[PDB]
Design a protein around this ligand. Structure first.
Ligand SMILES: Nc1ncnc2c1ncn2[C@@H]1O[C@H](COP(=O)(O)OP(=O)(O)OP(=O)(O)O)[C@@H](O)[C@H]1O
Ligand SMILES: Nc1ncnc2c1ncn2[C@@H]1O[C@H](COP(=O)(O)OP(=O)(O)OP(=O)(O)O)[C@@H](O)[C@H]1O
Ligand SMILES: Nc1ncnc2c1ncn2[C@@H]1O[C@H](CSCC[C@H](N)C(=O)O)[C@@H](O)[C@H]1O
Ligand SMILES: [Mg+2]
Ligand SMILES: [Mg+2]
Ligand SMILES: [Mg+2]
Lengths: 424, 291, 394
């Protein structure tokens, strides 16, 4: 790893917490196998090198031809929180702070444009499908030069040293969590809340990046809860009320459907590649005593039903294609978690009206939120559209209807919608 | 109907030696999911030998093959079976023995005799006379056609009860020493049948596999729990022949043609079979037998 | 792999496609610490001679992709099978057929239906570009850049100065020579850190480190260039006659027949006149080495001997610079200790022995209802599954 930092600022070397007089302007420290050497080649230019013996960044195990030590976004990640840590402090705490030999605060010395360059970075992902780097879309200061294969070189521009350095670390942490090292792709459990703040120390990171970092980097429900407020507070400052949740929309969904419906009434699964089924005998845990009905137009699903009945565990599973093969005349809980928009449009009203005739106790329906699509990178309803749909088929009857959204919430808008129709 | 309902499968490989059925099966059980192979030849290899044996051994090998297949089929395990058999008397029998337990299927392995003896034997063609048509045969039951025996309905209504282990549980007692039999405990549900039995015109006949020598300790047990009975039929003293033999004699000599048996209550299988299978009479089985 | 349902897929595909051989892993030749050669030409021949194999062939070793050529008489309907079990069909059917008439023209197809011949499909980048790009070129570049920087910059100069100053040395004396886990702690690691981080820096013989990078670059530039498709055929497996009958060739000397007017090699080293003959064979493999080749392959003359492996590969040290790092040349004693070809060899053997068993099924009978085929494939497949877990530099 090789990292040059420029500015025309006279007090650069000051800001980086380094003394140009001390041992020729070198600052050394062991990294892993190891040795990281910071270098004042002058003011106006600092040069971090990372040497290595062997296997500092890619397991000795891999019988591979290893060169991560020379370009892994992680070496950068370390070099930040090990040479330039105070630089990555915080908006308030940094700008308003003394200097070793004061000439006012940081807000006075660090006002000169800073350029920082990486000789060799490695980005093996969708976020660098060749030509360009995906964060270039969202940060105009990032400058890529391809070298070969998945390797590139970085040049980071900033109005301040703080601005520049906090982008490099944003690059490093986003690039790393979206990157496969191949079989050795791994993230420790202490990773989040060692870097989780980098996403909050640069000022226009999109919501999708936060989601990504939550789902790929925060290993423990316990630790998600400790970062959750830092994230949310950041988005408040940026002008968005965002809830955030560890579990992932799906399944965060499946969770909701389970806890709501409960095990006391036989299920009628409407759109099913079978996953809702399994979930309903999570071992004995839910001592599910009833049979279990499923339907689907898909020939493919029709057949898979039977592949479980020739036979693996499909003991109380009854699957039907024609709707007059369903004869069960007792109370049922009933499920529609995609289905209504996956397609079959406005026959969607036909389908659900059919259900409301069927002796049920509780229904749940689910569709994408649409107002959510802004937040990422076969029709689709807004809640007004959806709420209108429920209305004009459940209408004029004595059914109790209750709404709620599932998944991360941004200004009241989740990415998934749900109704719970309860017959009195 | 309308409903889905599945039973395990029995796949009968039918064919000559060298025709490649054991090869298919090795591939099959290794790639399919829930299957167990049963080979007759592998069996007679526990008994050490080349693949024909004493009519004693081969009858015993049959007893084992059948037990195991049923054992597994009952367990919902699919069974492939390596029929060296190949005949018709075998096949049709094979089918009889099995279909009721599972859905039978067939896979033939035909192969030119010029090619067949090139799997190196004994130059001998087999009964391959494409008979029967090897169409798959779903599970069949045969028996809800219950048909008793034509007993003279003039003779007086009567029921029949076993003592040992049916109206009179042992509670530890030695099976063959029914001297201590006045300590025995009452299987009340049976006792309750015999009660309501004699409330209608029914003669209640006790028929027991006890040495007649133990008659006294028995009548004690009976009057102790207030059992209202007409006859008490007992095994001859020093007899010792099997239960069903001595009970059947007892039945034909006494009960038969003098009474009209409305049903019987008994415990052990050996006897239940006789009643049902030989004498063609309704017999209810009170507990589990298999002594 | 092991999912019954999808191995079942793969096999079915192998049957429908009419494939008649698989392929073997090929082991390195056994090492000689004596000769300080990690894969030893000597040892691999000796290995063969002491197992009774006394007629052997030595071919050049082509840096390409393994390709079983199913040459039909109607050239247009030939096909290609990969290293493992799969048909190769993503090349320009013309460009290929064209590169195959060279071979086709060396035969006479009177009553001959088909000739399964194994070859190396060349060059490497036809199937290996991007493995070339993403891995090799990447690894090269990384070191080149790093090397360049250590040459141009003031880093090495400033480190050798501090490594003279009086403050330093004092540290390296009264800590190497004096032993305590608190020989006081000269300011909060402050200098314990810094002075220990220096000296524990790995200097590099910068012209050597460059010359070694250049070796790697050289090697990459021999084998890694693109890419007019062609073939090096090296053994005929079986021929099949319209006649109905087939011919299991089983002669690794079929080489000079099927293309490769390239120098084969052939000794009847019988009763250790090998040892007298070894030095010639060595001199010859050195030409092949001093030429621009990966190296050589040692095979028994009879392609399939029972219990015998199919070949030993013997790659030259320069080329192995592509497999192990730039410093493979230096770390030889290390990397040789590390090497263990038993088990690679074990698989090499079974693979080849299955393969003969596969070839044994007549072409006319490859199909989905041939369960001797199917077991053999599943057998080979389980073998794949095992042999893949090995050093992977073999
Ligand atoms: N399609 C085929 N092509 C070539 N050889 C085959 C083929 N199928 C089976 N064989 C070989 O034929 C020989 C006999 O096959 P197999 O063991 O299946 O006989 P079998 O029908 O089980 O006879 P048995 O009644 O003794 O079990 C085996 O060695 C097997 O490898
Ligand atoms: N003359 C030859 N005879 C046999 N194989 C050759 C020859 N020349 C080149 N080869 C190729 O060499 C391969 C083995 O050498 P190499 O080490 O380059 O391959 P590999 O990718 O490691 O395969 P494996 O791991 O199966 O040995 C064979 O699979 C074959 O493709
Ligand atoms: N009108 C209809 N009646 C029955 N099934 C329908 C239907 N319209 C669509 N479907 C089926 O419903 C399925 C929904 S896919 C939904 C899978 C699951 N609920 C999830 O969480 O992702 C589709 O496979 C589709 O074939
Ligand atoms: Mg890698
Ligand atoms: Mg009894
Ligand atoms: Mg090769």
């Amino acid at each position: 790893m090789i990292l040059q930092i420029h500015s025309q600022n006279p007090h650069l070397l000051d800001l980086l917490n380094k003394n140009p007089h001390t041992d020729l302007g070198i600052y050394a420290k062991s990294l892993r196998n190891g040795q990281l050497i910071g270098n004042a080649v002058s003011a106006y230019q600092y040069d971090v090198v990372f040497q290595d013996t062997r296997y500092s960044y890619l397991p000795e195990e891999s019988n591979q031809i290893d060169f991560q030590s020379y370009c892994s976004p992680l070496v950068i990640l370390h070099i930040c929180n090990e040479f330039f840590k105070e630089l990555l402090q915080e908006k308030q705490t940094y700008w308003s702070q003394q200097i070793k030999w004061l000439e006012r605060t940081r807000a006075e010395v660090d006002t000169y444009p800073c350029t920082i360059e990486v000789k060799n970075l490695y980005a093996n992902s969708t976020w660098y499908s060749k030509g360009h780097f995906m964060m270039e879309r969202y940060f105009k200061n990032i400058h890529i030069t391809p070298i070969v294969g998945n390797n590139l070189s970085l040049r980071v521009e900033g109005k301040s040293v703080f601005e520049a350095m906090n982008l490099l670390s944003f690059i490093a942490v986003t690039t790393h969590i979206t990157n496969t090292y191949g079989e050795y792709t791994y993230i420790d459990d202490h990773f989040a809340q060692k870097y989780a703040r980098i996403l909050t120390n640069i000022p226009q990171v999109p919501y999708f990046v936060f989601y990504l970092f939550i789902k790929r980097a925060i290993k423990s429900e316990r630790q998600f809860a400790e970062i959750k407020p830092m994230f949310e507070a950041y988005f408040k400052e940026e002008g968005l009320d965002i809830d955030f949740q560890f579990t992932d929309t799906h399944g965060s969904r499946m969770d909701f459907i389970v806890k709501e419906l409960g095990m006391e009434y036989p299920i009628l699964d409407i759109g099913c590649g079978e996953l809702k089924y399994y979930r309903r005998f999570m071992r004995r845990n839910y001592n599910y005593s009833h049979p279990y009905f499923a339907t689907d137009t898909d020939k493919s699903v029709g057949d898979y039903a039977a592949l479980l009945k020739e036979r693996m565990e499909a003991d109380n599973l009854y699957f039907f294609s024609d709707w007059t093969d369903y004869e069960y005349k007792n109370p049922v809980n009933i499920i529609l978690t995609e289905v209504i928009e996956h397609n079959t449009p406005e026959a969607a009203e036909a389908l659900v009206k059919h259900c409301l005739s069927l002796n049920f106790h509780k229904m749940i329906i689910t569709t994408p939120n649409s107002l959510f699509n802004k937040y990422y990178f076969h029709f689709e309803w807004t809640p007004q559209e959806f709420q209108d749909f429920i209305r004009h088929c459940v209408g004029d009857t004595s059914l109790e209807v209750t709404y709620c959204g599932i998944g991360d919430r941004i200004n009241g808008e989740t990415p998934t919608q749900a109704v719970v129709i309860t017959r009195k | 109907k309308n409903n889905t309902h599945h039973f395990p499968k029995l796949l009968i490989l039918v064919g000559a030696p060298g025709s490649g059925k054991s090869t298919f099966a090795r591939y099959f059980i290794r790639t399919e999911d829930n299957w167990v192979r049963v080979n007759r030849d592998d069996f007679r290899l526990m008994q050490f030998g080349d693949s024909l044996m004493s009519p004693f051994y081969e009858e015993r090998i049959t007893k084992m093959v059948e037990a195991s297949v049923i054992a597994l089929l009952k367990n919902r395990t699919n069974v492939i079976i390596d029929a060296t058999n190949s005949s018709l008397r075998s096949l049709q029998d094979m089918v009889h023995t099995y279909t009721e337990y599972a859905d039978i299927s067939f896979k033939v392995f035909d192969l030119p005799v010029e090619e067949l003896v090139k799997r190196c034997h004994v130059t001998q063609l087999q009964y391959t006379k494409e008979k029967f048509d090897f169409k798959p045969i779903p599970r069949a039951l045969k028996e809800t056609s219950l048909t008793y025996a034509d007993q003279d309905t003039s003779l007086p209504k009567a029921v029949i009860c076993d003592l040992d282990g049916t109206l009179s549980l042992l509670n530890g007692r030695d099976p063959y020493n029914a001297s201590t039999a006045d300590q025995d405990l009452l299987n009340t549900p049976v006792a309750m049948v015999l009660k309501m039995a004699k409330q209608q015109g029914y003669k209640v006949i006790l028929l027991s596999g006890r040495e007649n020598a133990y008659r006294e300790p028995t009548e004690r047990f009976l009057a102790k729990y207030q059992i209202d009975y007409d006859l008490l039929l007992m095994r001859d003293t020093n007899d010792y022949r099997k239960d069903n033999i001595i009970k059947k004699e007892l039945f034909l000599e006494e009960i038969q043609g003098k009474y009209f048996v409305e049903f019987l209550l008994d415990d052990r299988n050996q006897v239940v079979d006789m009643w049902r299978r030989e004498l063609a009479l309704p017999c209810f089985q009170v507990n589990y037998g298999d002594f | 792999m092991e999912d019954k349902t999808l191995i079942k897929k793969r096999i079915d595909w192998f049957c429908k496609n009419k494939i008649n051989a698989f392929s073997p892993t090929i082991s390195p030749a056994p090492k000689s610490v004596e000769r300080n050669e990690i894969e030893s030409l000597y040892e691999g021949i000796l290995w063969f001679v002491l197992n009774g194999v006394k007629e052997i062939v030595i071919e050049k070793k082509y840096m390409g992709s393994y390709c079983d050529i199913y040459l039909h008489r109607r050239l247009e309907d030939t096909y290609l099978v990969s290293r493992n079990g799969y048909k190769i069909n993503h090349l320009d059917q013309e460009q290929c057929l064209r590169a195959l008439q060279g071979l086709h023209d060396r035969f006479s197809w009177d009553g001959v239906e088909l000739r399964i011949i194994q070859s190396e499909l060349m060059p490497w980048s036809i199937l290996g570009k991007g493995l070339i790009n993403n891995e090799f070129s990447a690894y090269y570049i990384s070191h080149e850049i790093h090397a360049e920087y250590l040459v141009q910059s003031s880093l090495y100069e400033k480190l050798q100065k501090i490594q003279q100053e009086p403050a330093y040395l004092s540290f390296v004396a009264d800590a190497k020579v004096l032993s305590a886990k608190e020989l006081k702690d000269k300011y909060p690691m402050h200098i314990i850190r810094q002075y220990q981080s220096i000296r524990d820096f790995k200097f590099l013989d910068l012209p050597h480190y460059q010359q070694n990078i250049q070796l790697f670059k050289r090697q990459l530039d021999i084998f890694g260039k693109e890419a007019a498709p062609f073939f090096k055929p090296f053994n005929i497996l079986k021929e099949v006659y319209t006649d109905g009958r087939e011919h299991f060739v089983n002669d690794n000397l079929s080489f000079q027949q099927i293309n490769d007017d390239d120098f084969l090699h052939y000794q009847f080293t019988d009763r250790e006149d090998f040892e007298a003959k070894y030095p010639q064979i060595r001199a010859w493999v050195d030409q092949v080495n001093q030429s621009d080749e990966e190296g050589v392959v040692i095979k028994p003359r009879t392609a399939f001997l029972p219990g015998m492996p199919p070949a030993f590969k013997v790659r030259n040290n320069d080329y192995l610079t592509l497999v192990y790092g730039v410093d493979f040349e230096d770390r030889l004693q290390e990397q040789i200790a590390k090497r263990n070809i038993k088990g690679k060899l074990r698989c090499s053997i079974n693979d080849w022995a299955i393969n003969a068993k596969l070839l044994a099924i007549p072409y006319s009978e490859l199909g989905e209802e041939n369960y001797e085929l199917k077991n053999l494939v599943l057998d080979r497949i389980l073998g794949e599954e095992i042999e893949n877990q090995l050093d992977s530099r073999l």
